Amino acid sequence: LAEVQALETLLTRELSVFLTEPGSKKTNIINRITGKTYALPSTELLRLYEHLEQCRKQGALMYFLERQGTYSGLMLDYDLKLNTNAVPPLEPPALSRLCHRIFVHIKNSSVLPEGSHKIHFFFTLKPEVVQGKYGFHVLIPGLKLAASTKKSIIGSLQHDATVQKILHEQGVTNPESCLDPHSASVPSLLYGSSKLNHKPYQLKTGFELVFDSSDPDYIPIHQIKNLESYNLVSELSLTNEQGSLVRPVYCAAMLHDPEARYLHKILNLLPPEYYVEYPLW
Amino acid sequence: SNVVFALANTSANYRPLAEWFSQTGGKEKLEKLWNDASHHTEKKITKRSIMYWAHKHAPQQYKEIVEQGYFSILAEYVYSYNGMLEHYMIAKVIYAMMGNKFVVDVDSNGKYVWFEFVLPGQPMNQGEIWKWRKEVNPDELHIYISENFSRVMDRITEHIKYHLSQPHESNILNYYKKLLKAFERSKSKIFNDSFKKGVIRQAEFLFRQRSFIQTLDTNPHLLGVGNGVLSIETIPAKLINHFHEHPIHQYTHICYVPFNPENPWTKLLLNALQDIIPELDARLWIMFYLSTAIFRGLKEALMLLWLGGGCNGK
Structure with missing residues (x-):
């Protein structure tokens, strides 16, 4: 495929010069398919996002992660157990109310800057329910938060009675324990990417929330209408600062490497029945 | 001396000499000038030694520069003849790529027998570790043409695709498309058995x-040993355990020299050999004659008779 070939050329010929060592904090981008780690400057991050976006629109297999580090956008990872194997409705009013409640906790952290600011919420959903297991990500990529503040906001969100109600009325049986408390620290999948055993989450709905410190009781939340007009890998990225839709608002602060060849014996080192080993160890 | 005998095969070796000894002082080795233009000498270390002079203190840049050379040779062969890759260009890249591991000779009956240098990451018999083994068919080269050289094949393909995905004119794009399709039809030929046999028979030359x-x-001073190559030029045994230019083929799979410790086995062997026959002023002639069997010839023509006794140490 042309756009995959283009991404391959960008990675090997050009971005190879930004390859980081294993466990290097400088790392912002992880390609879990090639097992490569990169520290991309903003210019080269954007070029990557243009290629990943073209690959996304053609349904290409991607497994890119961004590292959140100490100061970046907020991601909420919900792992739902459902009543049934039916995708829950999750219509705009429920998602709109979720945004409001998420914002109340952000505001209560006291780190928002004074003045008038737009922040965008994006809901990406697991494409199907598998054995009653369902998922969504809430991405607030533009709202640049300290890791410690994200952890605090996530702690508060787990105990939110209104959020638990919304999730319950959607058919969620684990509304108390569905929000991953490590949402603040885990590397976050780029839009169009997934674990190799899963399919990528799909953008259902995005919302624009405006807050004004002078008028704190007015918190307008509206659906974003022309989402398709933007580079979604770009806009949804927690570490991006050069989005068009998403403009930053700054808040107060495995080594065996088989390389697709040697792992085959791994596939037959599991179904030995060799638990008990008197001579067989 | 090592590098000058290494690159003395070049007729214009004085320019690499002036390149190398232009670096603390030196001044052409105080104006030695190949020891004031010495004549030819014995078969010393060759060009194939220099890449083993490297790769032990700088492996990454050496690997990158040889990969770039391989890509350059294959790219000039592909660009000169649009997509057709016949036996000789593949043989030329293979010679540039494995030239320090395989040789071939016409020894006895006019047949081309191969000799492969072995590595510790290879299946040997018992003791062929750092010496040439005789081969009738280059099985390692037959695997290497299809496995390792295919990586250079996809490298050339990736370069062609990168040149195709460029803002050029229409005629350049059409030429690159024709080159890519002809090259893609010729790419699978490196797995064909007849093509690989022709490549082997062309690389034989x-x-x-x-x-x-x-x-x-x-030479008598180099000896095939189970652990590698044993040398007895100097007083200490060298025990050559690296790449070398010495072209020895025969070996002993059971010698396995652990230098010379003073462990229990050596002590009991010494106690077995001596303290049975009394000697005066440390007479050692007979087991000194037990030595010099690791030499070829040009020695004394002695003839020792051990015969005598029924169940003695004969």
Whole structure:
């Protein structure tokens, strides 16, 4: 495929010069398919996002992660157990109310800057329910938060009675324990990417929330209408600062490497029945 | 001396000499000038030694520069003849790529027998570790043409695709498309058995040595050992455990020299050999004659008779 070939050329010929060592904090981008780690400057991050976006629109297999580090956008990872194997409705009013409640906790952290600011919420959903297991990500990529503040906001969100109600009325049986408390620290999948055993989450709905410190009781939340007009890998990225839709608002602060060849014996080192080993160890 | 005998095969070796000894002082080795223009010498270390002079202190840049050379040779062969890759260009890249591991000679009956240098990450018999083994068919090269060289094949393909995905004119794009499709039809030919046999029979003329069988085990001071190559030029045993230019083929799979410790086995062997026959002023003639069997010839013509006794140490 042309756009995959283009991404391959960008990675090997050009971005190879930004390859980081294993466990290097400088790392912002992880390609879990090639097992490569990169520290991309903003210019080269954007070029990557243009290629990943073209690959996304053609349904290409991607497994890119961004590292959140100490100061970046907020991601909420919900792992739902459902009543049934039916995708829950999750219509705009429920998602709109979720945004409001998420914002109340952000505001209560006291780190928002004074003045008038737009922040965008994006809901990406697991494409199907598998054995009653369902998922969504809430991405607030533009709202640049300290890791410690994200952890605090996530702690508060787990105990939110209104959020638990919304999730319950959607058919969620684990509304108390569905929000991953490590949402603040885990590397976050780029839009169009997934674990190799899963399919990528799909953008259902995005919302624009405006807050004004002078008028704190007015918190307008509206659906974003022309989402398709933007580079979604770009806009949804927690570490991006050069989005068009998403403009930053700054808040107060495995080594065996088989390389697709040697792992085959791994596939037959599991179904030995060799638990008990008197001579067989 | 090592590098000057290494690159003395070049007729214009004085320019690499002036390049190398232009670096603390030196001044052309105080104006030695190949020891004031010495004549030819014995078969010392060759060009194939220099890449083993490297790769032990700088492996990454050496690997990158040889990969770039491989890509350059294959790219000039592909661009010169649009997509057709016949036996000789593949043989030329293979000779540039494995030239320090394989040789071939015409030893006895006019047949081209191969000799492969072995590595510790290879299946040997018992003791072929750092010496040439005789082969009728280059099985390692047959695997290497299809496995390792295919990586250079996809590298050339990736470069062609990168040149195709460029803002050029229409005629350049059409030429690159024609080159890519002809190249893609010729890419699978490196897995064909007849093509690979032709590549081997063409590289038989390119991997030549012209003197390899003539000097195989000619010198007496180099000995085939199970752990590698044993040398007895100097007083300490060298025990060559690296790449070398010495073209020895025959070996002993059971010698396995652990230098010379003073462990229990050596102590009991010494107690077995001596303290049975009394000697005066440390007489040692008979077991000194037990030595010098690791030499070829040009020695004393003695003739020792051990006969005598029924169940003695004969």
